[PDB]
Amino acid sequence: MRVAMISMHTSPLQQPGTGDSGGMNVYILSTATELAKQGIEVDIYTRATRPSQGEIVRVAENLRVINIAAGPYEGLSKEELPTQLAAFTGGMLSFTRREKVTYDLIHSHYWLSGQVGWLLRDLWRIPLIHTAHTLAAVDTPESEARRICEQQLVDNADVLAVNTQEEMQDLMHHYDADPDRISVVSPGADVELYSPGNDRATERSRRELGIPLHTKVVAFVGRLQPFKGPQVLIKAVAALFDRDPDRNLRVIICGGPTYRHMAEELGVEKRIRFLDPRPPSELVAVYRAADIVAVPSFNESFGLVAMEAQASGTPVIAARVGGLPIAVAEGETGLLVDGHSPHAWADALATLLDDDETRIRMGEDAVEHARTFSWAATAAQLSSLYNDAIANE
Amino acid sequence: MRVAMISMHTSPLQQPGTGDSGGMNVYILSTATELAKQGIEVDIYTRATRPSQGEIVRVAENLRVINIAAGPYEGLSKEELPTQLAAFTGGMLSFTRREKVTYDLIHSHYWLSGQVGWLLRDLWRIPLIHTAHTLAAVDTPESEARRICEQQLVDNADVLAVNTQEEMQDLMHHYDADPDRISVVSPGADVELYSPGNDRATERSRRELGIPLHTKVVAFVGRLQPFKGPQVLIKAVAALFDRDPDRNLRVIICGGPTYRHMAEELGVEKRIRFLDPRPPSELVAVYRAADIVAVPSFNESFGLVAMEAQASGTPVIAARVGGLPIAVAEGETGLLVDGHSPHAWADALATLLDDDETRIRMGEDAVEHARTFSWAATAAQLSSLYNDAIANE
Ligand SMILES: O=c1ccn([C@@H]2O[C@H](COP(=O)(O)OP(=O)(O)O)[C@@H](O)[C@H]2O)c(=O)[nH]1
Ligand SMILES: O=c1ccn([C@@H]2O[C@H](COP(=O)(O)OP(=O)(O)O)[C@@H](O)[C@H]2O)c(=O)[nH]1
Ligand SMILES: [Mg+2]
Ligand SMILES: [Mg+2]
């Protein structure tokens, strides 16, 4: 079996969580890697942005990323990429003609890639599996246009792969999706890498990151974009220091795009530390160093960060949003906050900070909870999904 | 020979000059009709917007318009149509598969259609002839994205068909075009329909349009969009009435999108009359009724309106912009104004209004000048262009 994955506007090779790269990229790369271990051949198609990479990047046996030239390597934001939809498709057409490569199935990611997938699937006469990741309908002409495209894929994809049951309901309510075409594919997290793991490990991580050993740490991990609510953490941390100015608390934000500006405007610069984004092998230390990972998203998911933090034995305080209530077991492995008021977040942070016995237990339980998430699981589900889709054409 | 013309965002069947429909539509329809008379089979592909029309409209022998469904019949402006580029292409792919129809050549119109054309031409292995009509480079992310697409077509189309030599220079300067790929195809105007024509014809037209027989008329014809400068006519007419409040002058604007609001704000409502847009068989009367057609474009062309007015024996006062200096023979069949100051336009209008002998002569000469423009000409040039393109593949 050879699968063409389409990830047009962002590449699985781009460092997550700056820029346009986040959980979807790690989702695409992680599943693809697992599929490739299982002997399924995957090529991930993406728009060429870094020419030093070449056209074909060989990631592992059975796994390639294909960098397709379509418009300039830069100066084209995600909002303008619809203008490249036909060029990118044409780019994929030539590459496959040149390489004489044939696919059994296409799995598209995000509405841009789905529009490409929809054309390719009719041309190649093979099934299209589509994963939305996020959706307009969950108020401008641009969002209206995206919604319309998202509606087209709902109506035309052979299988709509969603990441939770809540997204399935979302598809059915906001897009009138046929429930027979929807399939829940639960996501994973790299649970071997993100792990507690060892009695001295938290403190080893603190030494490595230059964090004081006797202090409480809240971490935010991910893209620094308003929809992710890092401003909520910063504002809540300000409130905490209004209540008790010498609270033993340091914050790490880790993190690519000003939020430092907001932090100094609120007087909390010296207790907040902004870390550059780093590969998973290095992120572990942020998770382990942390007593609490705060994830104040306005929109989401699953919530890969919530899962990775859990896997690493660190309780999460999450917004009651997207996949987060499924990623976090409320009251057992963390807390869920309603809304994004600094006051409500201060409350939730304070209750986990000041109750050691509870917080420690959540962290230990978070590990047990997170082992239910299993990229290799995820791929096993996709593999079946692919086999059925192929069998029914 | 069977040619697929692509006109994605606007249909040759849409009434010119409201909305998104103007000279390009009449260019597409007029050439296609002439090509079809010459035994060349043309299908014009467009986005479906009026379902009462059906999928295939049979216009004449050898001429069809194909309405391709891609996104909703409405609620999608031209700016958001890039989001439909892959759906529209996919739509064309299915239609041709269903109908088992094969093309010798593609002639695309406007950058959207060219992006579709570029993908189709590699797939079908046939030449792409592209006509830009207008160009971004002749300052927002959206215009930057369009420019980039326009640059891609310059680099990839087999023939760049332009409408004047000035556009050729524009292609070469702003887009680094290869001069070997550029071919000037001079446009036409329906010179039999738009004609003087008969000694009592001007006055017959005035009776028909309810215009007083003893008055001077300036007409503006075309889409009421700021880039067309109808505001310039309105402001200039205001200036004329500041200089001499009982000047014998009436204005007809004809015309789809407020400019009536501007007119009342300036005190000139009662001398200005706004006409709904009408088919060519009815527009003739506007041209004949007129003593002067003012065309204060900020961007253009050729300038089909300038040509049609000339053909109908009516002098033109045009902005020195786009194709207008070629469409109008300065000092012989009309005047050219530099810039768009009401004062400069008042001057130019006043000199043609108050000098009958000159104006009458220009009108007579305008006829002789306009017969150099010849849709059947235009098509003869395209026909050769197509034959060469086919011969070189
Ligand atoms: O320094 C960093 C911070 C972020 N991440 C990754 O970025 C992803 C962000 O996931 P999240 O679900 O929060 O982002 P979103 O779903 O909003 O795209 C996670 O997988 C992190 O491992 C990373 O690799 N390095
Ligand atoms: O009531 C009207 C007014 C406009 N036109 C047509 O609209 C076109 C507008 O041409 P122009 O070159 O001025 O528009 P543009 O090039 O800006 O698209 C001309 O062919 C006119 O015949 C028309 O058919 N009916
Ligand atoms: Mg920890
Ligand atoms: Mg006249």
Q: To probe the interface with B, which of A84, A96, A119 has the most B CB atoms within 10 Å? A: A119
- Separation of CA A80 from chain center: 22
The verdict on a CB contact (< 8 Å) between A83 and B116 is no
- Separation of CA B132 from chain center: 12
B95 — contact with chain A (CB < 8 Å)? Answer: no
B80 — contact with chain A (CB < 8 Å)? Answer: yes
B195 — contact with chain A (CB < 8 Å)? Answer: no
Backbone CA torsion sign across A151, A152, A154, A160: negative
What whole-number distance in Å separates Cα of residue B172 and Cα of residue B348? 33
Nearest CA to ligand 2 atom 1: B277
Q: How far is the CA of A279 from the centre of ligand 1 (A)?
A: 10
What whole-number distance in Å separates Cα of residue A382 and Cα of residue A324? 22
Asked if residues A5 and A133 have their Cβ atoms less than 8 Å apart, the reply is no
What whole-number distance in Å separates Cα of residue A77 and Cα of residue A10? 11
Let me know if A377 is exposed, middle or buried by CB neighbors in 10 A (0-12, 13-18, 19+): middle
Judge whether B91 is annotated as a binding position. Answer: no
**Number of residues written out for chain A:** 393
What whole-number distance in Å separates Cα of residue A75 and Cα of residue B153? 18
What whole-number distance in Å separates Cα of residue B120 and Cα of residue B118? 6
B386 — contact with chain A (CB < 8 Å)? Answer: no
Which residues sit opposite A105 in a β-bridge?
A3
Taking phi over 0 as left and psi of -120 to 50 as alpha, with beta for the rest, A303 belongs to left
The verdict on a CB contact (< 8 Å) between A76 and B122 is no
Amino acid letter for position B280: P
What whole-number distance in Å separates Cα of residue A110 and Cα of residue A97? 25
The nearest CA of chain B is from the CA of A124 a distance in Å of 11
Let me know if B241 is exposed, middle or buried by CB neighbors in 10 A (0-12, 13-18, 19+): middle
* Closest A-chain CA to B77: A141
Q: What is the DSSP string of B310-364?
A: HHTT--EEEES-TTHHHHS-BTTTEEEESS--HHHHHHHHHHHHH-HHHHHHHHH
The verdict on a CB contact (< 8 Å) between A141 and B85 is no
Instruction: Please give the backbone phi and psi of residue B266, each rounded to the nearest 5 degrees, phi first.
Output: -95, 0
Asked if residues B280 and B43 have their Cβ atoms less than 8 Å apart, the reply is no
Ligand 1 close to Cβ of residue A272 (< 6 A): no
Cβ contacts of A115 on chain B, cutoff 8 Å: 83, 85-87
Let me know if A41 is exposed, middle or buried by CB neighbors in 10 A (0-12, 13-18, 19+): middle
A101 — contact with chain B (CB < 8 Å)? Answer: no
Ligand 1 close to Cβ of residue A280 (< 6 A): yes
Backbone CA torsion sign across A157, A159, A164, A170: positive
User: SS3 for A67?
Assistant: strand
Let me know if B28 is exposed, middle or buried by CB neighbors in 10 A (0-12, 13-18, 19+): buried
Domains B1-188+371-393 and B189-370 share a fold: yes
What whole-number distance in Å separates Cα of residue B64 and Cα of residue B57? 6
What whole-number distance in Å separates Cα of residue B224 and Cα of residue B28? 21
The nearest CA of chain A is from the CA of B102 a distance in Å of 16
Question: Which tokens go with A41?
Answer: 């051949």
B78 — contact with chain A (CB < 8 Å)? Answer: no
Experimental method: X-ray
Ligand nearest to C-alpha B17: 2
CA Rg value for chain B: 21
Question: Which tokens go with A172?
Answer: 């059915």
| H helix runs in B134-200, sequence order | 141-156, 165-174
Domain ranges of chain B: 1-188+371-393, 189-370
Candidates A80, A85, A141; nearest CB to B85: A85
Candidates A75, A76, A141; nearest CB to B80: A141
Ligand nearest to C-alpha A316: 3
Q: How far is the CA of A195 from the centre of ligand 3 (A)?
A: 9
- B/e letters for A321-340, b = 16+ CB within 10 Å, e = fewer, are bbbbbbbbbeeebbbbbeeb
The verdict on a CB contact (< 8 Å) between A145 and B80 is yes
**Number of residues written out for chain B:** 393
The nearest CA of chain A is from the CA of B90 a distance in Å of 5
| H helix runs in chain B, sequence order | 23-37, 85-99, 110-124, 141-156, 165-174, 201-209, 230-243, 259-265, 280-289, 304-311, 324-327, 342-354, 356-370, 375-391
Atom of ligand 2 lying closest to residue B301 CA:
16
Let me know if B127 is exposed, middle or buried by CB neighbors in 10 A (0-12, 13-18, 19+): buried
Atom of ligand 1 lying closest to residue A275 CA:
1
- Separation of CA B8 from chain center: 16
Q: B107: closest CA among B64, B49, B44?
A: B44
Check: CATH 3.40.50.2000 for A1-188+371-393?
A: yes
A69 — contact with chain B (CB < 8 Å)? Answer: no
CATH topology of domain B189-370: Rossmann fold (3.40.50)
| H helix runs in chain A, sequence order | 23-37, 85-99, 110-124, 141-156, 165-174, 201-209, 230-243, 259-265, 280-289, 304-311, 324-327, 342-354, 356-370, 375-391
Asked if residues A201 and A288 have their Cβ atoms less than 8 Å apart, the reply is yes
Q: To probe the interface with A, which of B45, B77, B81, B83 has the most A CB atoms within 10 Å? A: B83
Ligand nearest to C-alpha A227: 1
A123 — contact with chain B (CB < 8 Å)? Answer: yes
For chain A, the farthest-separated pair of C-alpha atoms sits apart, in whole angstroms, at: 67
Q: What is the DSSP string of A307-375?
A: HHHHHTT--EEEES-TTHHHHS-BTTTEEEESS--HHHHHHHHHHHHH-HHHHHHHHHHHHHHHTT--H
Candidates B76, B86, B141; nearest CB to A89: B86
Cβ contacts of B90 on chain A, cutoff 8 Å: 118-119, 122-123
**Pairing between β-strand B249-254 and β-strand B216-221 as defined by DSSP bridges:** parallel
Q: A223: closest CA among A1, A383, A26?
A: A26
Please report, for residues A84, B115, B144, B153, B178, the alpha-carbon distance to residue A77 in angstroms, rounded to integers and kept in the order given: 11, 19, 11, 20, 29
What whole-number distance in Å separates Cα of residue A307 and Cα of residue A374? 10
Cβ contacts of A141 on chain B, cutoff 8 Å: 77, 79-80
Task: Give all strands of the β-sheet with A2-6 in edge-to-edge order.
Answer: A56-60, A63-68, A41-47, A2-6, A105-109, A128-131, A159-162, A182-184
Number of other residues whose CB lies within 10 A of the CB of residue A65: 24
The nearest CA of chain A is from the CA of B24 a distance in Å of 21
Backbone CA torsion sign across B267, B272, B275, B280: negative
What whole-number distance in Å separates Cα of residue A69 and Cα of residue A54? 10
The verdict on a CB contact (< 8 Å) between A80 and B149 is no
The verdict on a CB contact (< 8 Å) between B144 and A75 is yes
What whole-number distance in Å separates Cα of residue B133 and Cα of residue B109? 7
* Closest A-chain CA to B120: A90
Instruction: Please give the backbone phi and psi of residue A288, each rounded to the nearest 5 degrees, phi first.
Output: -70, -40
Taking phi over 0 as left and psi of -120 to 50 as alpha, with beta for the rest, B54 belongs to left
Judge whether A131 is annotated as a binding position. Answer: no
Kindly provide the resolution of this structure in angstroms, with one decimal.
2.6
The nearest CA of chain A is from the CA of B221 a distance in Å of 30
Asked if residues B196 and B229 have their Cβ atoms less than 8 Å apart, the reply is no
Question: Which tokens go with A327?
Answer: 């990623």
What whole-number distance in Å separates Cα of residue A114 and Cα of residue B178? 35
- Separation of CA B342 from chain center: 24
